[PDB]
């Protein structure tokens, strides 16, 4: 049972520990050029490239230090809401309504090849590698697939409802997402079984994460709250909730060291919330429209979040 | 720097690009087609002018006309219907052969009470037609209206029954001066069709153009 | 399946010693800063 | 016409060097004051040889509403929009005509190019805010009875392109004041005054009156009741009964507001410059008719203050661009 082994919490374990505080937050710089609303990005593991995805039918790569356009690719379909940017810097993913992962290749831009083979929206991908790319659709099912062959290598099941996120480990090797059932399902890739389900939430989930170490991870869901699930306890961790905010979430990121936990709200903001201590350590303001898509860079030199005014803004 | 000079400079031929593109989107108007019986989505792309969502490009009167059909899409409408916001106009298509079957009128009044009164669908306005005219005529001898509302206004007749379900189209619709609805009966003629389309859409663009002009 | 204290205690030594290279939690120099 | 330093006395029925004004007829050079002969005279050539509270408060409204208007843009709309570069264009226009009246107190109570200079940011200010309120009154209509055309014409470039062509030819009309203007202190105090050549006085002046008044008020309420007549009749059709009847009082009340703001300014033009009603008054027909023109003048300036206001806070959509920026 896993009431059984919930003996104590991780609040009156990090108790002890020092609080953060408040956190010096300031727009450092802010992206300008896209035409449309924002619904996903991806940070490389560089650090200088960034990727984005509007509404407008362009997907254009951003260049974070310099703040400049280094590539502009013209999408088939305007309606986009997923992107993602392979560790290797050479192909970027692309979804929307077409139930397709469009695949461009940087280095030549040419297009190199659209996989089809879903039947629901297209909501996140992530790049496992420079050859395998794991994909979530609105058919309440994941799936794994192939640059190489173009075709559906495994097909992770067993949600109700559709999912809409999906992130990967350190090591690549286990991945989770969440669905408005509630449920988050921890899946392998080589053998592609799912290994537990980690649910109770009161609502859809939008937002999914894994911690820097790989055995906890965060989920966020649209009544307000964050919770986190550590694949050890194979439970509820903690929970990040507040009276104030009413409005759901859409992005949820961690930092490199995990203190602090980005999570994208729908009050025009976002809210940074300590991931041990569950006591909040700033506001992240200044957009004018919803925010729907934020990402960490991987050295944690910097914070890309962009919001529907088809901009994105820099904290360090 | 001429590194760095080369960056700047391939990002403002990038920006020259998005801009004359962007242009393009703002001249070429959007519509929205939904259909809960799956009424919608058909007997509209069958013009002489003409994988998950169906794209229709047309020019009618120097105007072009941009079609989404989502049909595929089986999925929660609430995680995707946020995305076709700010277009030109909603094309919602309706049969009125649709209240027999299994209910399927009380489905179809259903989802268009859902985006006509959703959030993000307020400031677009929504045109709405009358499908399966002709099939329209003949069922009301045999099959009275009033298995679909309890109300049939008494006269049973086409005359009646068409403004009944036209009327009852608005009750679902909360917000009259905030919002506006169209409502016209499909035709046999394929261009008789679009000239409601282009009418409306015509009229759509002067709504904005005021808001814009601040006469609104 | 292990105690919640147990991998509670390993989440928060994980970031113990991952707190110094945070420059979320610990601000880097603006010159050592590339924004 | 360009302040009330403008006023000198004329020489109306005929040892110091000075010029008199361009807004009485028959002039004079004046000498106690000789006034010989403007030209053909041999001693001439010779000698030639060798309520303020309320005015201030006005233009601060004014100033902080241009400015408004102007931040508002790049902050939220950020000129995507090609009606945006044409009100952005206004507002700049309306500062040059009001930020003159704070260098006119200056200049008096303490040189010449400097004059001219600033009697020419005025003159092509007020120019720019005619032709943009014009052209603002022809997007309307070319957006209202011409969606589709608007939609496949209105461009950025476009109205940049128009905004330059605007100023061009704004510059153009004025030079002629440009050129035929003089300082002509001959006093104590700074006094800055227009004079014309003299060769050509009549006819040259009465060119320069009708050319301020037709730009002034014949286009532009043409170009205003043909374009509200179009908005009209496509609007009739709107099928909502609040939004209609607002859009057209709010027409109405443009078109009332830019009369009763701009046409008495004209008027008091073409009865001072003619001089046929009454010419023989010396100072009679003087001081009121100075008085006049401050009032005229004063109420332009108010007008100019006004423009931004009805001309972005009438809309709906504006007004909640403030309040988030604001916030």
Redesign the interface.
């Known amino acids: 049972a896993r009431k059984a082994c919930a003996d104590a919490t991780l609040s009156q374990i990090t108790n002890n520990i020092d609080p953060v505080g408040r956190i010096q937050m300031r727009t450092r710089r802010t992206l300008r ?1 896209h ?1 449309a ?1 924002i ?1 996903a990005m991806h940070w490389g593991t560089d650090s200088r490239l960034l990727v984005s995805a509007s ?4 997907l ?1 790569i951003w ?1 974070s230090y ?1 703040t ?5 690719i ?1 999408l088939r ?3 986009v ?1 997923t992107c993602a940017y392979a560790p290797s810097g050479n192909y970027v993913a692309c979804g ?5 992962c469009s695949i461009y290749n940087l280095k030549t831009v040419r297009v190199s090849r659209e996989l ?1 083979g879903h ?3 297209l ?1 996140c991908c992530r790049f496992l590698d420079d050859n395998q790319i794991v994909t979530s659709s ?3 099912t994941c799936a794994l697939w192939d640059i190489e062959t173009g075709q559906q290598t495994t097909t992770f099941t067993g949600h109700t ?2 999912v ?1 996120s999906l992130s990967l480990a350190p090591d690549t090797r286990l991945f989770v997402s969440g669905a ?1 059932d509630a449920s988050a399902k921890l899946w392998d890739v080589r053998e592609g079984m799912c290994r537990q389900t980690f649910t109770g939430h009161e609502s ?1 989930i939008n937002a999914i994460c894994f911690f820097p170490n790989g055995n906890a991870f965060a989920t966020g869901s649209d009544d307000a709250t964050c919770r986190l699930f550590d694949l050890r306890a194979d439970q509820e961790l903690m929970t990040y909730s507040h009276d104030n905010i009413i409005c759901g979430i859409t992005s949820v990121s961690f930092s490199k060291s995990g203190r602090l936990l980005l999570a994208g709200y729908d009050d025009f903001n976002c809210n940074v919330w300590d991931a041990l201590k569950a006591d909040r350590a700033g506001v992240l303001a200044g957009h004018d429209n919803r925010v729907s898509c934020l990402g960490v860079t991987d050295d944690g030199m910097a914070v890309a979040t962009g919001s529907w005014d088809s901009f994105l803004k820099i904290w360090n | 720097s001429a590194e ?1 000079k080369a ?2 400079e ?2 403002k031929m ?2 020259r ?3 004359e ?3 393009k ?3 070429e108007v959007k519509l929205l087609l939904l259909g809960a019986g799956e009424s919608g989505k058909c007997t509209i792309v069958k013009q002489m002018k003409i ?3 169906v ?1 229709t490009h047309f020019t009618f ?3 072009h006309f941009k079609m ?1 059909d ?1 049909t ?5 409408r609430k ?2 219907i946020h ?2 916001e700010g277009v030109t106009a909603i094309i919602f298509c309706v049969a009125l052969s649709d209240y027999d079957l299994v209910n399927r009128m009380h489905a179809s009044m259903k989802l268009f009470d859902s985006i006509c009164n959703n959030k993000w669908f307020t400031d677009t306005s929504i045109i709405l037609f009358l499908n399966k005219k002709d099939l329209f005529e003949e069922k009301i001898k045999k099959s009275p209206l009033t298995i679909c509302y309890p109300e049939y206004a008494g006269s049973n007749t086409y005359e009646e029954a068409a403004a009944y379900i036209q009327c009852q189209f608005e009750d679902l619709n909360k917000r009259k ?1 905030t919002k ?1 609805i169209y409502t016209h009966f499909t035709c046999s003629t394929d261009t008789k069709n679009v000239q409601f389309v282009f009418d409306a859409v ?1 009229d759509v ?2 709504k904005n ?8 | 399946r292990i105690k919640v204290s147990k991998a509670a205690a390993d989440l928060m030594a994980y970031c113990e010693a991952h707190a110094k290279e945070d420059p979320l939690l610990t601000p880097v120099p603006a010159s050592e800063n590339p924004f | 016409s360009p302040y009330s330093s403008d006023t000198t006395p004329c020489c109306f029925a005929y040892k110091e060097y000075c010029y008199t004004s361009g807004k009485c007829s028959n002039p004079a050079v004046v000498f106690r004051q000789v006034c010989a002969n403007p030209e053909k005279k041999w001693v001439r050539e010779y000698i030639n040889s060798l309520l303020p509270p309320l005015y201030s408060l006005v233009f601060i409204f004014g100033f902080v509403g241009n400015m408004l208007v102007i931040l508002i843009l790049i902050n939220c709309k950020r000129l995507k ?1 090609m ?1 945006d570069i044409y009100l952005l264009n206004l507002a700049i226009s309306d500062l040059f005509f009001l930020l003159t009246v704070p260098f006119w107190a200056h200049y008096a109570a303490a040189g010449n190019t400097m004059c001219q200079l600033l009697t020419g940011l005025y003159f092509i200010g007020f120019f720019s805010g005619i032709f943009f309120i014009i052209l ?1 009154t022809i ?2 209509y070319l ?2 009875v011409h ?6 014409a209105r ?2 470039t476009f109205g940049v392109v128009t905004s330059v062509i605007t100023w061009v030819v704004a510059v153009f009309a004025s030079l002629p004041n440009i050129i035929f203007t003089r300082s002509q202190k001959c006093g104590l105090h700074y006094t800055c005054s227009s004079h014309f050549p003299y060769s050509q006085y009549q006819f040259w002046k009465n060119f320069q009156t009708l050319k301020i008044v037709i730009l002034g008020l014949v286009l532009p309420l043409l170009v205003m009741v043909i374009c509200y007549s179009g ?1 009209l009749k ?2 009739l059709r709107c ?5 209609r009847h ?2 057209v009082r ?2 109405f009340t443009i078109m009332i507001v830019y009369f009763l703001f701009w046409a008495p300014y004209n008027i008091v033009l073409l009865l001072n410059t003619f001089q046929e009603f009454f010419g023989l008054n010396n100072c009679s027909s003087s001081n009121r008719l100075d008085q006049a023109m401050q009032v005229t003048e004063t109420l332009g300036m108010t007008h100019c203050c006004i423009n931004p206001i009805i ?8 007004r909640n661009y403030l309040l988030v920026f604001f916030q």
Not at chain 2, 210 to 215: A, F, T
Not at chain 4, 147 to 152: E, I, P, T
């Open positions: 050029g035409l609303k619904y509404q407008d039918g362009k254009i260049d310099t400049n356009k280094v590539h502009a013209p379909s305007s309606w809401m929307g309504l077409d139930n397709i089809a039947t629901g929206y909501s609105g058919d309440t409802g559709d809409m408005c859809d | 760095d960056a700047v391939r990002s990038i920006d690009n998005l801009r593109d962007g242009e989107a703002a001249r994988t998950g969502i794209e009167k120097d105007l989404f989502v595929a899409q089986r999925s929660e995680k995707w995305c076709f001066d506006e015509t663009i002067i153009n005021l808001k814009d002009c601040g006469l609104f | 929009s009606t603002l997007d309307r957006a209202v969606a589709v055309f608007a939609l496949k461009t950025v908005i496509t609007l099928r909502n009964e609040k939004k607002r859009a709010l027409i001309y972005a806070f009438v809309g709906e959509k504006f």
